[PDB]
Amino acid sequence: AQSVPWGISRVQAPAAHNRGLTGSGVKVAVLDTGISTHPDLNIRGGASFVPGEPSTQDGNGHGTHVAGTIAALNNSIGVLGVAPSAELYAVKVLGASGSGSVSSIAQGLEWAGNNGMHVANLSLGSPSPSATLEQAVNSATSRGVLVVAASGNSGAGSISYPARYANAMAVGATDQNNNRASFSQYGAGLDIVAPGVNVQSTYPGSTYASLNGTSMATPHVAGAAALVKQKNPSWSNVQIRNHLKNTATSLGSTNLYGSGLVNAEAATR
Ligand SMILES: [Ca+2]
Ligand code: NA
C-alpha cells in the first residue's frame, strides 16, 4: 500500500497529477548527502564532490529523505513525491555527518549548470556569507537552473546562506495548522513556505522515516517547480519562481511566510 504524506496533500500535488503533470522530462539535482538506492526511487545519475567519497550513495539518510519528497514513485508501495516522474540526480556535496564545505557546494552548483539541470534543491545552509557561494548561485542561475534552498532551523529572524542570496529561492517550513514552524528561519529574502513538520519519506535501508526541518519544506517547492516546468517547458527559472510565489496561498506577513504556502494545483491551473 502507498501512503500520501500529509505535506504532499497539503501542497495539492495530487490535483496536478490528475491533470497529467508529474514532472516527466524535468531534471532535478539534489545537492545533499547523496541518494541511496530504494524501491520507491529512480536515480538517473549524479556526481560526488566530497573528497575521498566517490559514490553518490547516502551515508547519512538526509539526501534520500529529501529526494523522496520530490520524487518518490507513484506505485503500490511507500510514499508519493510531489513530482513522481522527475529525473533525479544525486549530487553529493555533504559528508555523512551532514557537514560540507563551500567548495563542495559550489562545485555541485557548477555541475548542475553544466549538465542542464532545471532545478537544484539545496536542503542545506551556511551561517556566514561566502562570495564563492554567491557566485556559484549566480552562475547556475545565469545558465538556467532554478536554485531552491532552505531558510534554516535556528528559529531566528534572518535566513541562512545561500537562501539569503537574491538568486536562490528561499523556503521556510509550516506545520499542520499552516503556522510557521517554531524552528523555521524567517526575515528578509524569504520567498515561500511549505510543510516541514513530521514529513514521512524514503530512507536508506529500504525503509521510511519522519523528519522535521526546513530541509523537508524545500523539496516540496523543488517538486512543484518541476510540475510547472512540465506544463510550461519554455519558461525560465525566473518565470517559474515568480509563478510559484504568485499562486501561493497567502498566510500573512511576508516577513514570516514570504508569499505563503506553495500550491501545486494553483500553479498548474
Ligand atoms: Ca510509492
Ligand atoms: Na533568496
Residue numbers in the entry: 1 to 269
Show me the paper's own sentences about this structure.
The crystals for both room temperature (RT) and cryogenic datasets were picked from condition G2 of the PACT screen, 0.2 M NaBr, 0.1 M Bis Tris propane pH 7.5, 20% PEG3350. The ambient temperature (RT data) were collected at 297 K, and showed negligible radiation damage; the cryogenic data (cryo data) were collected at 100 K. Images were integrated using XDS and scaled with Aimless. Savinase was crystalized in space group P212121 and diffraction data were collected to 1.1 Å and 0.95 Å resolution for the RT and cryogenic crystals, respectively. qFit and Ringer were used to construct multi-conformer models of Savinase for both the RT and cryogenic crystals. The structures derived from the crystals at room and cryogenic temperatures are very similar, with an RMSD between the structures of 0.20 Å and 0.37 Å for the backbone and all heavy atoms, respectively. Thus, the two structures show no regions with major differences. From the multi-conformer refinement, we find alternative conformations for 28 residues in the RT structure and for 25 residues in the cryo structure. Most of the residues with alternative rotamers are serines, 14/28 and 12/25 in the RT and cryo structures, respectively. Except for the peptide segment 128-132 in the cryo structure and the dipeptide 103-104 in both structures, the residues with alternative conformations are isolated in the structure and do not appear to engage in any cooperative network of conformational change. We have demonstrated that Savinase, except for alternative rotameric states of 25 sidechains is well described by a single conformation for the RT structure. The qFit and Ringer analysis of the crystallographic data did not identify significant minor conformations in this rather rigid enzyme structure.
